[PDB]
Design an enzyme around this catalytic site. Structure first.
Site, PDB file in Angstrom:
ATOM      1  CG  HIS A  45      15.893  18.062 -15.721  1.00 36.24           C
ATOM      2  ND1 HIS A  45      17.232  17.815 -15.533  1.00 36.24           N
ATOM      3  CD2 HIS A  45      15.225  17.434 -14.733  1.00 36.24           C
ATOM      4  CE1 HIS A  45      17.378  17.075 -14.444  1.00 36.24           C
ATOM      5  NE2 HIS A  45      16.169  16.828 -13.929  1.00 36.24           N
ATOM      6  CB  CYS A  86      18.305  13.460 -16.639  1.00 33.21           C
ATOM      7  SG  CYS A  86      17.155  14.494 -17.577  1.00 33.21           S
ATOM      8  CG  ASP A  89      23.951  13.743 -16.155  1.00 33.56           C
ATOM      9  OD1 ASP A  89      22.844  13.622 -16.708  1.00 33.56           O
ATOM     10  OD2 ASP A  89      24.646  12.776 -15.739  1.00 33.56           O
TER      11      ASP A  89
END
Length: 225
Positions: free
Chosen positions: A219, A46, A43
């Site tokens: 990520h 992270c 989002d």
């Protein structure tokens, strides 16, 4: 468990890049050094969410290390004030972070900690705190970040645009800053799709890590040695 997952076997993430030779090779190599993974929601928050959860999880049941960390957390309002943040504007975020540190101390369970980090409101207040602390730490050490990271960068604008706002993606400056700001040693494993070595970096250089993260597809997920 929509923000931070239950623990999974490391090879469970092969299904995220099926029939991808290089990702399969690197995840297989990773599985030789690490046994388990937790996934985080992608989002834009992270890094903060994963570091916050994994570091606090690493403190559970460790009475000396909890005492020392609480002592540091109690001083963080001074870091914020010195960088020009106003107490009435950071209070709600500091209080949320102090609350989860006290939960680590009083409750001491993985389950309780994971529930707070999966509560959208508590978790986001924690992330916002960590973002403000990162910003304060960079601002208060602007000469350091210019000397060692980038002599041409505009520190105040960077913090305003790329640290303080929710959902803004991190770079190595925010990782170094938040690691230093909370005295957290962390190791990041890098998995890209180039036919290169699986490699890692420890923040800071000297240190035994508390936290291991996997960086892949912009990520961060949490690794267990």
């Amino acid at each position: 468990f929509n923000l931070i997952s239950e623990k999974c076997d490391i090879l469970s993430i092969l299904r995220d890049h099926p029939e991808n030779r290089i990702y399969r090779r690197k995840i297989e190599e990773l599985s030789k050094r690490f046994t388990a993974i937790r996934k985080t929601k992608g989002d834009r928050n992270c890094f903060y969410r994963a570091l916050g959860y994994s570091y606090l999880e690493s403190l559970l049941g460790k009475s000396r290390e909890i005492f020392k960390f609480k002592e540091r957390v109690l001083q963080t309002p001074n870091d914020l004030l010195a960088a020009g943040f106003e107490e009435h504007k950071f209070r709600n975020f500091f209080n949320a972070f102090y609350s989860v540190v006290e939960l680590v101390e009083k409750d001491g369970s993985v389950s309780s900690l994971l529930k707070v980090f999966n509560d959208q409101s508590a978790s986001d207040h924690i992330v916002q705190f960590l973002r403000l602390l990162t910003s304060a730490f960079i601002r208060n050490r602007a000469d350091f970040f210019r000397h060692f990271i980038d002599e041409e960068m505009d520190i105040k604008d960077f913090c305003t645009h790329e640290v303080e706002p929710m959902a803004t993606e991190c770079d190595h400056i925010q990782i170094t800053a938040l690691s230093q700001a909370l005295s957290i040693a962390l190791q990041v494993e890098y998995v890209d799709e180039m036919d290169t070595a699986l490699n890692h970096h420890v923040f800071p250089e000297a240190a035994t890590p508390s936290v291991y993260l996997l960086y892949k597809t912009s990520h961060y997920n949490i690794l267990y040695a």
